[PDB]
C-alpha cells in the first residue's frame, strides 16, 4: 500500500522492492509505455486508467443524452485582446479556477478574437495548480482543436466549445488551470481587464476584478508563468450530472426478410451491440427498418462521444488496450506464490483479464482461480486472486499485465489501485 503512493522509478538499474509491485496510476515511471500491447491512458486526477477512443455506413442521433450540462462558472466581461503567444510574435496563456465541491467537468467555453489558417490548430489542456499558486507540469486533460472548430467574432460573441474524451473530475477546494498552447503566431483571445471599457459597452468599465478566484497567466515556454492579477480570460466551465439511461437512434435502412432475421440475431444485449436494441419496420417488403439502442448511463461517459455526431461504425466499435508494467527482477527474492489485487469498474460488455509472466513477457500465463470480490464503492469492485502459480520450484522474474476490452465505444472499463505481492510457500 505504501509503495502504491511512491510513483517514482529510476531508469538505469532501479532499486526495486523485493516481492512487491504496485501501480498508483500517477506517473509513467512504473509503466512500460513502449510495449507493443500498451494502449491504456492514465487519468491522474482520479488516479485511474481507461481506454481512449480509436476509430480502427449510416448515421445516428443521440436522442436521450447521457448527462445534462450546466454552466456554473462564467466570466463574461471582456475589454482587450491578448495574443496566445505574446513573447514570440515576430517583429501560451492560462487561467486558474476552483470549485467548493466535487464537480464533474464535462466541457469548456472559450472566446477567440481571431484564428490562423485552415491547417492551424490549438492545443487545449487542463493542468493542476501547485502549492504556491502556479500551474504545474501535470496534465489532467488534453485535446486538439482545428481551425474550423474555433469560432471567432469581433464582439466576443462566438463561443467555441471544447470537449474532452475523458471527463475532468475536479476535487473540492483544489485549484485547476486551463492551459492554451499553439505554435501558430496568429491566434488571439478576448481578455477582461479591470478599469478598461467593455467592448460592446464602452460607456461601462470593469469596476471590480473580472473573476476574483482566478488569475490570468502568460509564458514563453509553458513553464515559467507571469501572472496578470488585474486580468482574466472570458471563459465558461460546464459541469454535468449523469442520468439513468441513454438512447441512440439510427437513420432508417441483404434481402429484408433474411436481413431482419440475420440482423436481430446479432443485435442483442450480449454481443458487441450492447444494450436494449429495438426497432420498428414497415410492411410490403419496404426497405426502411429504423433501429434504436438504449443503455445504462454512468458518470464516466465520454463528453466527446456525446457531443459528436455518431455513426453505426463509430458506435459499436470494440475498443481494446492493455496495461504492461516494467519487468521486475526477482532474482534475490525467488517466489512460487502470487497474490494479485486490483479494483475494476466493469460496465456491461467489458472485461479485465489479469495476466503475469515469469520470463520477461515471452509467455503470458493466466490464473486458474476465480477472484474473490469485495465491493469498494458504487462503481468499482475489488478483485483479489491468491494462487500458488508454481507447484514446485520458484520463479525469479515478474511482470504484471492487465487486459482491457470493450464491446462498444461509450461503455469502457476503468482500473485503479493495482497491487501485486509474491510469496515463497
Amino acid at each position: 500500500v505504501n509503495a502504491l503512493d511512491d510513483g517514482a522509478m529510476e531508469g538505469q538499474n532501479p532499486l526495486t522492492l523485493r516481492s512487491v509491485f504496485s501501480e498508483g496510476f500517477i506517473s509513467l515511471d512504473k509503466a512500460d509505455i513502449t510495449h507493443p500491447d500498451f494502449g491504456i491512458v492514465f487519468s491522474f486526477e482520479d488516479a485511474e486508467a481507461t481506454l481512449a477512443y480509436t476509430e480502427a455506413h449510416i448515421w445516428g442521433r443521440l436522442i436521450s443524452a447521457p448527462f445534462t450540462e450546466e454552466r456554473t462558472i462564467y466570466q463574461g466581461q471582456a475589454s482587450e485582446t491578448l495574443n496566445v503567444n505574446p513573447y514570440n510574435i515576430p517583429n501560451p496563456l492560462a487561467q486558474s479556477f476552483q470549485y467548493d465541491e466535487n464537480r464533474t467537468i464535462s466541457s469548456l467555453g472559450l472566446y477567440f478574437a481571431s484564428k490562423g489558417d485552415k491547417q492551424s490548430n490549438v492545443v487545449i489542456q487542463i493542468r493542476g495548480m501547485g502549492d504556491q499558486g502556479y500551474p504545474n507540469k501535470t496534465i489532467y486533460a488534453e485535446t486538439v482543436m482545428n481551425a474550423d472548430d474555433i469560432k471567432v467574432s469581433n464582439n466576443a460573441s462566438a463561443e467555441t466549445r471544447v470537449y474532452f474524451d475523458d471527463p475532468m473530475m475536479a476535487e473540492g477546494g483544489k485549484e485547476y488551470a486551463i492551459v492554451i498552447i499553439t505554435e501558430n503566431s496568429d491566434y488571439t483571445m478576448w481578455v477582461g481587464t479591470r478599469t478598461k471599457p467593455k467592448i460592446d459597452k464602452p460607456n461601462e468599465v470593469i469596476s471590480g476584478n473580472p473573476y476574483l478566484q482566478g488569475v490570468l497567466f502568460s509564458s514563453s515556454n509553458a513553464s515559467t508563468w507571469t501572472p496578470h492579477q488585474n486580468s482574466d480570460l472570458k471563459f465558461g466551465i460546464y459541469t454535468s450530472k449523469f442520468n439513468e439511461t441513454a438512447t441512440i437512434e439510427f437513420e432508417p435502412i441483404k434481402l429484408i426478410l433474411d436481413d431482419m432475421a440475420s440482423s436481430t440475431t446479432f443485435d442483442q444485449l450480449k454481443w458487441e451491440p450492447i444494450g436494449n436494441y429495438q426497432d420498428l419496420d414497415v410492411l410490403g417488403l419496404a426497405r426502411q427498418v429504423k433501429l434504436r439502442a438504449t443503455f445504462e448511463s454512468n458518470r464516466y461517459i465520454s463528453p466527446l462521444m456525446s457531443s459528436s455526431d455518431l455513426t453505426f461504425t463509430t458506435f459499436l466499435t470494440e475498443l481494446t488496450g492493455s496495461y504492461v508494467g516494467r519487468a521486475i527482477d526477482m532474482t534475490e527474492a525467488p517466489y512460487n506464490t502470487v497474490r494479485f489485487s486490483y479494483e475494476a469498474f466493469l460496465p456491461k460488455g467489458t472485461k479485465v483479464v489479469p495476466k503475469y509472466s515469469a520470463d520477461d513477457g515471452k509467455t503470458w500465463k493466466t490464473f486458474t482461480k476465480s477472484p474473490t470480490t469485495t465491493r469498494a464503492n458504487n462503481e468499482f469492485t475489488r478483485y483479489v486472486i491468491d494462487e500458488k502459480v508454481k507447484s514446485s520450484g520458484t520463479n525469479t522474474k515478474l511482470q504484471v499485465r492487465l487486459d482491457l476490452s470493450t464491446e462498444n465505444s461509450f461503455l469502457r472499463p476503468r482500473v485503479r489501485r493495482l497491487m501485486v505481492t509474491t510469496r515463497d510457500e
Partner: protein, 182 residues
C-alpha cells in the same frame, strides 16, 4: 557419397535451386541468410548489460528503435556508440551512448543464418526419371523463411554411388565376381 557446402546464389526472381548429384538420398542441412524485422526485445535489469537475441547466429544489426504506436519511431539508437554486436548473440550496451531504461521493451532488426526446415521453409520435388532425374529446393511456402536476395545458399546432402564389377572364371570352372571400388 557426401556433398557438402554445395553453393548456389539465391535469386528472388527464381526460387528453385538444383542439386548437382542426381541420386539424392537425404538433404542434411539447408542454410541461408535471413532478415528478421521488428523483433521485440526486453531490456535487462543490469545497466550497460547484454540482451540475448532469439537466434544465436546473428551477424549484423540493421535497426534498433522503440515505438509507442505502430509506425511512429520514438527514438532510433545509433550503432557503435549506443550499442554493438557482441559474439553474434547479444545487443551489448557497454558503449557510452544512450540505452533504454531497465525493464523496457524495444525492437531489433538483424540478419542471421537460419537452418531451413524441410516442409516448412522449403519443399523438395523432382522432374526427370532415371539418371537424368534431378532434385530441386523450391522454397515454395509463403510463411516459410526465404533467403536474402543475391546471397549464397549452402546445401549438404548425400547421394548413392555406382559400382562396377568384373566377372572371372578359373580352371576349375568356378565363375566368380570381384567387387570394384564404389
Amino acid at each position: 557419397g557426401t556433398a557438402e557446402n554445395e553453393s548456389t546464389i539465391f535469386n528472388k526472381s527464381n526460387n528453385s535451386i538444383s542439386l548437382a548429384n542426381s541420386p539424392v538420398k537425404e538433404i542434411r542441412r539447408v542454410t541461408g541468410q535471413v532478415l528478421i524485422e521488428k523483433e521485440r526485445v526486453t531490456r535487462g535489469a543490469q545497466g550497460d548489460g547484454q540482451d540475448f537475441l532469439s537466434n544465436n547466429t546473428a551477424f549484423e544489426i540493421v535497426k534498433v528503435w522503440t515505438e509507442t504506436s505502430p509506425g511512429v519511431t520514438t527514438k532510433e539508437y545509433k550503432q557503435g556508440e549506443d550499442f554493438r554486436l557482441t559474439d553474434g548473440q547479444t545487443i551489448d550496451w557497454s558503449p557510452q551512448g544512450q540505452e533504454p531504461s531497465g525493464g523496457t521493451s524495444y525492437y531489433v532488426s538483424y540478419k542471421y543464418n537460419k537452418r531451413m526446415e524441410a516442409g516448412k521453409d522449403y519443399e523438395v520435388t523432382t522432374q526427370g526419371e532415371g539418371l537424368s532425374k534431378k532434385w530441386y529446393i523450391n522454397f515454395t511456402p509463403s510463411n516459410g523463411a526465404k533467403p536474402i536476395d543475391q546471397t549464397v545458399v549452402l546445401v549438404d546432402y548425400t547421394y548413392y554411388l555406382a559400382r562396377k564389377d568384373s566377372v572371372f572364371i578359373n580352371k576349375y570352372g568356378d565363375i566368380a565376381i570381384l567387387p570394384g571400388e564404389p
